Structures are given as C-alpha cells and as structure tokens.
RNA sequence: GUGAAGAGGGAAACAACCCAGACCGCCAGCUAAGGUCCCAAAGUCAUGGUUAAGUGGGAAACGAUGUGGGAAGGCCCAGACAGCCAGGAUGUUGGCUUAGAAGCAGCCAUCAUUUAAAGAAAGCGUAAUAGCUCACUGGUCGAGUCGGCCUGCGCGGAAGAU
RNA sequence: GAUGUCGGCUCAUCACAUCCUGGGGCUGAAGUAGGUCCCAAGGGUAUGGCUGUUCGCCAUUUAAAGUGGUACGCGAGCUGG
C-alpha cells in the first residue's frame, strides 16, 4: 500500500519552510538514485495519520507528485519536538 | 455495520434453524428469571428438544425478508424460539410447564408444517397418536382446520346472535 | 432490591442432625423457630452419613414460614474430600499440588451429576477440570 | 472496638441468642472498656478477661518516661 | 540524591537557559515523560518525582532517568549587604527546555503508566506530556 | 435522542385553548389549567412547539423541548392529576388537616399552619400519611417540599417530613 | 464538604453541574462528595 | 537609542517609551504614531468569523458535558445511543490465605457450563457467603450517536486598610 | 537648610484573611457540646498584678477579651518612664 500525494516545492530555506509549516504542510525531500534530489510537500494532517502505522517506515511507498509517480522507501524524519508533527521528512528512491 | 462478529456470522445459522423447525413456537421472555430457561436448557441438548431465545429485533426484520416456515407478524416483543424437528409433542409438552410461572398465552402462536397452531389448536397439536398413524391423523387434521373450520365458524357466531 | 427470592445460600454444621446442637446456635440467632426446627431438625437429617458440613438452602416466601432444606456438599468440597489430597496450592501451576487420575474425575462427575451444569458428563467433568487446575491439581495421565 | 485497642481476634462463634467473640487484647488500654461496651450495645452486652501472657509493645511512652519516675 | 563527584569549578554563572533542546526523544525505554515547558529543575525535585512514580507504579518495571543535575546555584545568607563576594553553593540545578525527556520506563501497561506520570507532573515546575517509543 | 428536535407533538387529549402565547388547558379535573409561557422564542401551532432565534445563543431547538415539557405537564394536570404522598415519621406530631390549612409540627409548641394555595388540596388517611391531591405538578410539589422544610428527615435514624424520600439515610451511634 | 480549586469525582456515580456560575460536584452516594466551587 | 542638553503629538497624567528634531509669521493643504459614540477632532463605516464575560478592562499551578473551529476515527434500521421493561447466570459459595472466605478479606490462577447471556468480578454494602448495583444479556424504542485527538475563545482558582 | 526617635493617655477611623453575635454546608455531628466550613463588617470586644517592654507571664473577669492598616494613627494635644 501506502499512497500519498504531493506537490513540488517552489520555495526554499526556513522562511519558506515555516510559512508552509503554519499552513498545514510540511516539506520533504526525495533524494536518491541518479535523478537529482527532488524537494516536495505533503499535507501535514494526511501523512501524519500514517506516522503511527509502522509500515510507513518499513514498506515501500507510492509517491505521486504533480501527478507523476516515483515509488520510494522512507528515510529518517525530523519531528518538532513536543507537538505531534513531522517537521520535515526525507525519502529515499528505489 | 452491524455490531459483533457473531451477529454478521449468525445469519446463515439462525436462518438454518429457522428453516429446520417442522414444529416451531414463538414464545415470550420478560419476567422469566433464570430457572425456567435453565431446567430445560441442560437436559434439552441431550434429550432432542430445542429451546433458544434469540434476538427478536434481528429475527423480526430477518423473518420478513426470509420465509422461516411462513410466519413473521406476531414475533413483536421479547421472544423465544421453541422447536422440535420431531413429531410435535416434545415442543408442546414443554409449554404448560412454562405455564407454571407465567401462563398459557406466552406462546403467541406456533407453526406446524405451514398450518398455524394457536393455543386453541395447541392441545390438539399436543394430542398425538402412535407415530406411523399420527402423521396421517395430523395430515387429515391440518387439511380440515385450513378451510372447513373457517367457513363453518365465521357463520356460527353470527348465527348465535340471529337465533336466540 | 428485587422482591421474593430463589436459591438462598447457607452452609451448616455436621452435628447430630436429628438433635440440633452443633447446628443450634447458628440456627438460634437467625430465628430458626420450633417450626423451622420441624422442616430442618425432624427431617433431611440422620440415616444420612455425617462427614462434611451440609448445605442448607432457603426459599423465601412467607405467611410467617420460610424454609430450610438439607442436601449434598458442593463440587469444590467434593474435590478436596474425594482425591486424598493435602490441601490446595498457593500458586496454581506456578506452585503445585498432587496429580489426579481423569477416571477419578469421571466418578467425581458421576456423583455430582445431579443439578451440576453441563449438558454432557464430558462437559460436566470439564468444569470440575477447571476447578481442579484452580486448586493446582492436574487432571493427569 | 476490640480491634481499635490493638486487640487481635482469636476467632468468633454464634451463641444461643447472640454471639461470642474471643481475642487477645492489650491491657493498659481497658480502663473505660466496660462502659464503652455498654455504650455500643444499648447497655446490653458483657465481657470477662484474664491475662494470658506477655507479647511485644510498640508504644513509645512507657520506655520514654522511665527516668522521671526512677 | 544525584550529585557529581568533583567538578572543575564549584560556583557558576547565572547562565542562559535560552533555546530548544538536542536531548529530545524517548529513546531508551518504551515510553516516557517529555518536559514540554521551559525552566529550571533541582536535584531534590528529580528525586521527589522518581520516588513518587516508583512507589505509584509498584515495581517489576523500572524507570530510567534522562536528566542529571550538574550545576551549582547559590544562596546568599539572609540579611547580607549586597555584594561582598558571590553566594555559597546551596543546591544543584538541571536545565530544562522544550522536548527534554525526563523519565522513560518499561514494561508497564499504558493506562497504569498514564496515572504514574500524572503524579510526577503534579510534583514539578513544568507542564510534561507523555511520549511512546517509535522507530526511525 | 428524541425530544430535542421532534417535540412529542403534545396531543390534544381534551382540550387545549391556545391564544397564541398565553395558554389555557381546558379540561375536567382541576379545571381551566393555565400557564403563561409567553414568547420565549417558543412559537405554537394548534398544540405544537416551534423555535425562533434566542438572544445571543440561537440554541439548537432546546427550549422548545422545555416548552413541550411544561405544556404537557400542564395538560396532564387537567386530565389525570396526581398523588403527592408526603408522610411523617416524627412521633405523629400534630398533622391536623383542615381544608385549605394544614397544621403540622416539629415538636415546636406553636400552630405551624401553612395555607395551601387554591389550586391544590390535601387530606390525611391517618396522621402519618398525607396525600396532597390535585392539579399542577409545579405548585403542588412546591407545597410538598415547603412542608418538608417544616423539617428534613433527621439523618441518623429518620424523624421528619418525607415526600419522595424513601431512601432516608440510616447513620448510627458512636461510629461504625 | 470542601471548597476547592480542584473538583473531581469521588464515589463513581457522583455528578457535575455549573449552577449559577461555578462548577459544583453533587452526589447520591455518601454526601461527603458535595465539593463546590472549582 | 533617548534624556542629560529637545520642545510639540501620543500612551488619562507621565525626563529617558512610541512618534517626531521647534529660524520667524498664517483664521492654508497632507500625514506619522495614535485614533475615529460622547466628554474630544474623525467611521455608532462596509465585510465576515468569534466572545455572554462587562471578559475586554491585573495574575499562576490547576481544575471542568462552558462555546465556535478542525481533520482522523469507532459505532451507523440486520435497530444504534440510551430511556422503559426484563434476565443478570452455571460449577461456584473458586483454590490457597484461614483473625473470617464472601466475585468485592490478602494472593494465585483467571478455569469451566446449558447461554440470546452475565467478570472465579468494576462499585456500593455488610455479619463470614447473606444484602445491593453493575457492564453483559433479551425486548420495546425507532436515530443519529459515542469515544478519542488537534483547536480558537471564555470560566473559577482571584482576600487587605480614606 | 530638619521625618522630634519607643511605650502609655485622649480621640479615633477603616479592612476582613470574623473573636463573638446572626444564617448555612459537612462531619470519625445522637443529645450535649464540638471539630471544620462557606457566609456576613452591623455592634460589641475586660479589669488587675508585675516591669521603662511593646509584649510577656499570671490572678480574675466576659459573650468576646480578634487580627491588620492609618510616619508600625502619634507631642504646633499630653507624658518623657
């Protein structure tokens, strides 16, 4: 399973990133493989719900972004560090 | 939807038992206390007579939507299923025994084959000869009570008012 | 509360039974009348073999006469008596008492096979299986 | 009440028209005891006691006082 | 209670308890108490909460402490004219800021563990919140 | 679930005179039995209970549930009427019933009186049982309670004026 | 009875009402539990 | 940075705060901060959301079926929520412990039976089981409801001298 | 370049975290008494012994002999221990 969808980031660095984090988004990256690292957003409420399903962290994930679709296995995540939130997450390409 | 896992599983089993009852009785709870169920409950599952009391809100909607030896209407209220697959006596010997701590009319009615047996009939369903001759006495009886008794009885109480 | 009552429990001394006195002072305080003495004292009494303190069961109903009935001791009691065991475990199965033959259970099933609930002797034996394990006693081969 | 004094019960028996309770009791406590009992029961109950033997004290004051007195 | 074996200096500044935390997440045991608030915490207080929680919980699990109190903090004796050399070291302070985990414990079922940190939260200066394990 | 948004439709069981906002229930047993529920955002049609926009709140159709209770209590006052068993354990004292006036006691020397308001009346089968009988569940339970304020049950063993209290506490002497 | 700054339930079937202004416990078991004004 | 050595406006008053840096005269226009009912100059202005406290317009730990926002969620007419009626069992009254075993006295083991079904037991309650309530279980009822989490806003906690 | 510094006397005045007196909750409150507690500022609230003390200890009294503010009420009124 695990299926999320996303938009590609048009901004960068903290001033951007907070103005998103306020707006119920959070930023992320797909790095890995030959293809340059791709910086992306997810919606915080959506991908939060699968933080506690632990297959979010073990299993291959379907990442659809812009409508073009990658497939990804997760990497380490930053969480902010007293309210439930993923502050920003990294993902790795298969 | 639909609560518990027995409640969505049970529908084939309740439907199976609700075909099976070649005599059946719809009978009443409320004010039983433990004993009147218990004293049959132990011996029954050895002795070949069945008594269950089962969910009457599901049974009343379920029976409408599935014929369970005809029947449906008068299940309403708190309701037991007494049943014998056997020739009718085991089911009917049980009811006057249920009558000690309630009454004769906690059965609302009973069914045999497709004929409706109410308490008026019930004594007669409860009078049963030697088995090979009984099922013939029972077939001539239910065939009598189906159309002959109506056409006589609907006239007779109006004749009682005309003829005094 | 809830009105008149079914199956009231009392558990009572293994005295002379036709005469009253090891039963008499427990009778005395609860107002076991000369009449209560007649259903219990006159009767369900001697020509029954004392060895176990006898259950005595009260049905309540009354124009001033509520009644007290003598019968057989209960399954937990019979297990302790019948098996020729010491006295039960401190910690069931993590401490232990004895071993018991399933066939002794079966005879135990057979004597208690009056009103004991289980519509089958096999079902019946199993409840007292679960008693025997609770006391620590493995139903064993 | 018996429990209160630091008494500890041996056990309890019914009696012909009432009840009998038997117990081990501290001694230095009892000098309101009969009136207290009378108080509880509506004057009805009664008691007797004798000294069985000796067993530990934990109360401070007996040991504490012993240099003022002698 | 908790106190260090011999420090290089033995009085120390006011210090600056500014910023967040690097000593965050529940990491050791199954679940723990996160600090969630800002402030200063004594040795004696850590003691008062860890005792309270072990007695509440009743052992056969145990609690792991992720705070140590290092730091000297002074009393000036009463009625002293201001100045006159820095005060004397009185009690030891542990520095808390958001996210600092305080306690982790193991083995204890959630609802009973929910009560068991509820007591320590009544015992400290700060507004703690329960956290559970999780990988990655 | 049910009464907050479907207000029992309070049937016309003989019979309801509805001005508009002033309501008189016109039946036999405590005759012409009336209540003024005004326009507390409670609109009516024939014997129905209809909402409007309360103050700041605007609720959720809530006091139409209430208005339905207070009119039906009023209607049922004129049809069935009802038993206020008020009772005394208290070593009898006084309990003269006389028409509109009740003389009770609390060991106090003086005529305790109390004059029943018109709408209800009372009598005593024996001194220790008093039935107040009649009309409206609100005034009638008030006079009952104001009579039990001639004294509570005493809480240890129960001496007092007892209305609904078939549960009087049974404390005891010299601790348990 | 006490007047408190923390009000919460004693015997299980105790009850909680904000009457007049201030949230009172009330009870049908043992009425120790009448603890107002929290 | 200012005051000191800086006025004027504003924050009622108010050196150092915010605004602003006064050459002199005007019965001229714009504007800053700050404001726009009236004391007093200007919007009782349009728009939408919220708060029932006079919060606004003094303050905490903490406490709560106080109100709006929010996704996720269980339940959801094959009958819910819970009200009303009704069962709440069976071995059993569990073993051990025993001051005394009672589901509810400490502990252990949580086991079994007919079940449409009731824990070898959640709370009251008592003398030793008795006594009582309880989910659970069955009817009627005839629908939305319950539980969690995030969350804006208000509440008490809040008692001192003309 | 003037805040005449402690106690008492005369006169006070308010605050209420109320001493008592009035209402009321609870109570391991039977009556009695009481413990506690929410309420309440109206009025009342000691004499005498000793010492420069404020206080204090103490006799005896009352219903009670409150606590606190008011340059720790106060000298262009008094004493000056």
UniProtKB/Swiss-Prot annotation, chain B:
<dbReference type="InterPro" id="IPR043141">
    <property type="entry name" value="Ribosomal_uL10-like_sf"/>
</dbReference>
<dbReference type="InterPro" id="IPR001790">
    <property type="entry name" value="Ribosomal_uL10"/>
</dbReference>
<dbReference type="GO" id="GO:0002181">
    <property type="term" value="P:cytoplasmic translation"/>
</dbReference>
<comment type="similarity">
    <text>Belongs to the universal ribosomal protein uL10 family.</text>
</comment>
<dbReference type="GO" id="GO:0005737">
    <property type="term" value="C:cytoplasm"/>
</dbReference>
<feature type="modified residue" description="N6-acetyllysine">
    <location>
        <position position="104"/>
    </location>
</feature>
<dbReference type="GO" id="GO:0043022">
    <property type="term" value="F:ribosome binding"/>
</dbReference>
<keyword id="KW-0687">Ribonucleoprotein</keyword>
<protein>
    <recommendedName>
        <fullName>Large ribosomal subunit protein uL10</fullName>
    </recommendedName>
</protein>
<keyword id="KW-0678">Repressor</keyword>
<dbReference type="GO" id="GO:0003735">
    <property type="term" value="F:structural constituent of ribosome"/>
</dbReference>
<dbReference type="InterPro" id="IPR002363">
    <property type="entry name" value="Ribosomal_uL10_CS_bac"/>
</dbReference>
Swiss-Prot record, chain C:
<keyword id="KW-0687">Ribonucleoprotein</keyword>
<dbReference type="GO" id="GO:0006415">
    <property type="term" value="P:translational termination"/>
</dbReference>
<protein>
    <recommendedName>
        <fullName>Large ribosomal subunit protein uL11</fullName>
    </recommendedName>
</protein>
<dbReference type="GO" id="GO:0070180">
    <property type="term" value="F:large ribosomal subunit rRNA binding"/>
</dbReference>
<feature type="modified residue" description="N6-succinyllysine">
    <location>
        <position position="71"/>
    </location>
</feature>
<dbReference type="GO" id="GO:0002181">
    <property type="term" value="P:cytoplasmic translation"/>
</dbReference>
<comment type="function">
    <text>Forms part of the ribosomal stalk which helps the ribosome interact with GTP-bound translation factors.</text>
</comment>
<dbReference type="InterPro" id="IPR000911">
    <property type="entry name" value="Ribosomal_uL11"/>
</dbReference>
<feature type="modified residue" description="N6,N6,N6-trimethyllysine">
    <location>
        <position position="39"/>
    </location>
</feature>
<keyword id="KW-0699">rRNA-binding</keyword>
<keyword id="KW-0488">Methylation</keyword>
<keyword id="KW-0689">Ribosomal protein</keyword>
Curated annotation (Swiss-Prot), chain E:
<dbReference type="GO" id="GO:0000049">
    <property type="term" value="F:tRNA binding"/>
</dbReference>
<dbReference type="InterPro" id="IPR000114">
    <property type="entry name" value="Ribosomal_uL16_bact-type"/>
</dbReference>
<feature type="modified residue" description="(3R)-3-hydroxyarginine">
    <location>
        <position position="81"/>
    </location>
</feature>
<keyword id="KW-0694">RNA-binding</keyword>
<dbReference type="Pfam" id="PF00252">
    <property type="entry name" value="Ribosomal_L16"/>
</dbReference>
<comment type="similarity">
    <text>Belongs to the universal ribosomal protein uL16 family.</text>
</comment>
<dbReference type="InterPro" id="IPR036920">
    <property type="entry name" value="Ribosomal_uL16_sf"/>
</dbReference>
<dbReference type="GO" id="GO:0005737">
    <property type="term" value="C:cytoplasm"/>
</dbReference>
<dbReference type="GO" id="GO:0002181">
    <property type="term" value="P:cytoplasmic translation"/>
</dbReference>
<dbReference type="InterPro" id="IPR020798">
    <property type="entry name" value="Ribosomal_uL16_CS"/>
</dbReference>
<dbReference type="InterPro" id="IPR016180">
    <property type="entry name" value="Ribosomal_uL16_dom"/>
</dbReference>
<dbReference type="InterPro" id="IPR047873">
    <property type="entry name" value="Ribosomal_uL16"/>
</dbReference>
Swiss-Prot record, chain F:
<keyword id="KW-0046">Antibiotic resistance</keyword>
<dbReference type="InterPro" id="IPR020040">
    <property type="entry name" value="Ribosomal_uL6_a/b-dom"/>
</dbReference>
<dbReference type="GO" id="GO:0022625">
    <property type="term" value="C:cytosolic large ribosomal subunit"/>
</dbReference>
<dbReference type="GO" id="GO:0005737">
    <property type="term" value="C:cytoplasm"/>
</dbReference>
<comment type="function">
    <text>This protein binds directly to at least 2 domains of the 23S ribosomal RNA, thus is important in its secondary structure. It is located near the subunit interface in the base of the L7/L12 stalk, and near the tRNA binding site of the peptidyltransferase center.</text>
</comment>
<comment type="function">
    <text>Gentamicin-resistant mutations in this protein affect translation fidelity.</text>
</comment>
<keyword id="KW-0694">RNA-binding</keyword>
<dbReference type="Pfam" id="PF00347">
    <property type="entry name" value="Ribosomal_L6"/>
</dbReference>
<dbReference type="InterPro" id="IPR019906">
    <property type="entry name" value="Ribosomal_uL6_bac-type"/>
</dbReference>
<keyword id="KW-0689">Ribosomal protein</keyword>
<dbReference type="GO" id="GO:0046677">
    <property type="term" value="P:response to antibiotic"/>
</dbReference>
<dbReference type="GO" id="GO:0070180">
    <property type="term" value="F:large ribosomal subunit rRNA binding"/>
</dbReference>
